[PDB]
Amino acid sequence: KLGKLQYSLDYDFQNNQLLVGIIQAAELPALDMGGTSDPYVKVFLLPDKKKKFETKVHRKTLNPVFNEQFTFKVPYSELGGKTLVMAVYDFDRFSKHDIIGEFKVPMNTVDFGHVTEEWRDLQSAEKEQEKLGDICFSLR
Amino acid sequence: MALSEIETRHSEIIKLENSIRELHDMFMDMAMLVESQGEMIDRIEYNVEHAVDYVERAVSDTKKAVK
Ligand SMILES: [Mg+2]
């Protein structure tokens, strides 16, 4: 309900690197005072959360246009089992930056060869039990 | 990039190779024609020198004939 996100995806086989472009976003819900939020998008490889990339902060727009580009130096063999995460955050100067949305893209569903660029609907990020342990015994 | 970029790259490259090949063949034909024409010039110069000899002897004879 927050809005949609237009992004670009393609792989450069000449340098063996992933080219992820953040085009823009639309119809984002407002969380700030003026009637518009201050959005910025954090993008990182889904498999390992290392070297996350963040875009510049846009002031008071529910339709931010970033038109930015990020490069993930990852071989083509490892790429297949690697996912992409694009999460939209709301900037706040005096508090925690609340997450507006998130989107995950499996690299086995992605087809490289033609330059991909699409709009995808944003969804609410996941917050389960912490322990995840089990004990087995018998009663008689 | 993608497979489209690589494919177009490959295509334009092949195009370049064919243009290059046509250039090559043109140069070959050039050398050929120039050579054959060279032989033609050989026989021309031959005939001309013979003509010069004949003319010279003729002129000598007439020059001795008039006086
Ligand atoms: Mg704010």
| DSSP for A84-138, written as a single string | EEEEEEE--TTS---EEEEEEE-TTT---SS-EEEEEE-BPPP---S--------
Contact A101, A125 (CB under 8 A): yes
Tokens of A77: 């063999």
Torsion B4-B9-B10-B16 (CA) sign: positive
Instruction: Provide the shortest C-alpha distance from residue A53 to chain B (in Å).
Output: 21
What is the structure's resolution, reported in angstroms to one decimal?
A: 10.4
State the Cα–Cα distance between residues A17 and A34, nearest whole angstrom: 40
Report which DSSP code applies to A59: P
Give the CA-trace dihedral at A117, A61, A55, A13, to 10 degrees.
Answer: 10
Residues of A whose CB is below 8 A from B1:
10-14, 115
- Please state how this structure was obtained: cryo-EM
Tokens of A36: 């518009």
**Contacts across the A-B interface (CB distance below 8 Å):** 19
Distance B35 CA to ligand 1 centre (A): 84
Tokens of A30: 């407002």
> CB of A89 within 8 Å of any CB in chain B?
no
| Options 2.60.40.150, 3.40.710.10, 3.90.950.20, 1.10.10.10; CATH of A1-127 | 2.60.40.150
Q: Which residues contact A85 (CB under 8 A, 6 or more apart)?
A: A43, A44, A45, A46, A102, A103, A104, A105
State the Cα–Cα distance between residues A88 and A31, nearest whole angstrom: 13
